[PDB]
């Protein structure tokens, strides 16, 4: 199969980020340049493509982890919160950032609305399988003993 799991997550997530960058429906909305990745970290992100890569990562997380609510996404997107001389709780992510990313994902049609979050839509699953076949095309010569032999 051309599943995503036959390829490393880095190349596939970067491919999904590039395909979302090609799509105009995903954009960094206004407050991307003055808010951090959530509440845990110290500073806003320094990478240029943080919003598209974050949406692609949320897509891959929804695919490999099923339907995920926004607060489950916030819990996944926490961090080692610095308190100075306090015992370093891991709190949450950000509600508005995750919600805007998820709304962009569903407007792109990859995420499917469900009661316990938003499971990934079937079309997104098929297109990401095709992208896995593309990235697996980059390493199709690894194991020749896989077609019907």
């Amino acid at each position: 199969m051309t599943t995503v799991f036959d390829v490393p997550a880095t190349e596939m997530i970067e491919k999904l980020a590039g395909i979302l960058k090609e799509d105009d429906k995903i954009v960094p909305p206004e407050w991307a340049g003055n808010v951090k990745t959530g509440v845990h970290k110290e500073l806003p992100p320094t990478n240029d493509d943080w919003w598209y890569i974050r949406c692609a990562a949320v897509l891959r997380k929804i695919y490999t982890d099923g339907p995920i609510g926004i607060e489950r996404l916030r819990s996944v997107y926490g961090g080692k919160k610095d308190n100075g001389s306090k015992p370093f709780h891991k709190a949450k992510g950000s509600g508005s950032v995750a919600r805007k990313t998820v709304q962009q994902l569903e407007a792109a049609g990859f995420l499917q609305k469900v009661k316990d979050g938003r499971t990934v839509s079937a079309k997104g699953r098929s297109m990401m399988d095709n992208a896995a076949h593309e990235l697996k095309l980059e390493l199709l010569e690894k194991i020749p003993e896989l077609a019907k032999y």
């Binding site: 407050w31 110290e42 500073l43």
Partner: protein, 132 residues
């Protein structure tokens, strides 16, 4: 060789790049300086020592502007008394307004004025073994 540069009478780290060069100046630290870098249209990671003076002039003008490239929930002087608006000082004016806001309270006999004039904690944490 731009080994060291000066901006608005405050010779910042000319060696250090744009994103951290403005943290050394009062009024901006870490978060709001990268907002200035976003507004001025200059990549922070580029070395300031290899920056010709025209772009440095644009950076100086942009940091002089500041408030038009900063949000409204990240200002140190929100709801500043009779002014009412939100401001963000720079230089000696923050300490000047702080000391006047403390000594007028001390004249008016407010509690925070006494706690500032006596060298005590104003937030009320226990003074048992602090500042010995």
């Amino acid at each position: 060789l731009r080994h060291l540069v000066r901006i608005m009478n405050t010779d910042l780290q000319g060696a250090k790049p744009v994103q951290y060069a403005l943290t050394g100046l009062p009024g901006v630290g870490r978060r709001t300086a990268k907002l200035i870098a976003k507004g001025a249209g200059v990549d922070p990671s580029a070395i300031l020592g290899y920056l010709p003076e025209e772009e440095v002039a644009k950076l100086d003008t942009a940091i002089g502007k500041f408030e038009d490239i900063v949000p409204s929930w990240m200002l140190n002087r929100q709801k500043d008394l009779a002014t009412g608006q939100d401001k963000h000082l720079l230089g000696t004016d923050i300490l000047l307004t702080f000391r006047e806001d403390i000594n007028n309270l001390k004249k008016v006999r407010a509690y925070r004025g006494l706690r500032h004039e006596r060298g005590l904690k104003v937030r009320g944490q226990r003074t048992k073994s602090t500042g010995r």
